[PDB]
Amino acid sequence: MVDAFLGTWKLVDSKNFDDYMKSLGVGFATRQVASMTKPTTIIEKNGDILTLKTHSTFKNTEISFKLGVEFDETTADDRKVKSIVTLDGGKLVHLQKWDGQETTLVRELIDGKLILTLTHGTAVCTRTYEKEA
Numbered sequence: 001m002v003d004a005f006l007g008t009w010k011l012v013d014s015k016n017f018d019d020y021m022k023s024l025g026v027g028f029a030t031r032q033v034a035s036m037t038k039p040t041t042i043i044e045k046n047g048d049i050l051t052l053k054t055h056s057t058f059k060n061t062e063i064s065f066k067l068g069v070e071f072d073e074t075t076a077d078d079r080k081v082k083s084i085v086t087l088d089g090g091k092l093v094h095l096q097k098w099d100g101q102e103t104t105l106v107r108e109l110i111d112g113k114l115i116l117t118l119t120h121g122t123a124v125c126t127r128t129y130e131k132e133a
């Protein structure tokens, strides 16, 4: 079910990431560095366990989870959240909850590119990743 998402992906387009970060309360200096970073995202599976790595010159993260099972997560911007990842309409949907807030990180494949849509508050960021061979 998740298999077309698996692999190594490189950021190739970003829209409204500053809006998203600002909505989350990220400080200017961090936003500034983040806006010039091009992360690599690695998604791998081992049975029912998915591992999602995000690597850059600034911050790195790694999470492991089972689809449909809540997990604790500490995000790149240091939020301690309750998370769940599920497939919905063929999209990989990641929901984070903390302090009564929510944000969604939705991944979908369009023409072989991975489109990540980040929503918090009214801010909607779209980032596009291409597969590395």
Ligand SMILES: CCCCC/C=C\C/C=C\C/C=C\C/C=C\CCCC(=O)O
Pocket (backbone or CB within 6 Å): 011, 021, 024, 026, 030, 033, 034, 037, 039, 041, 054, 055, 056, 058, 059, 060, 061, 075, 076, 077, 116, 127
């Ligand atoms: C480890 C993330 C590396 C790239 C971004 C650089 C710095 C992170 C700093 C702040 C960003 C604020 C919120 C983190 C939440 C989502 C970022 C996902 C970006 C992506 O997956 O495209």
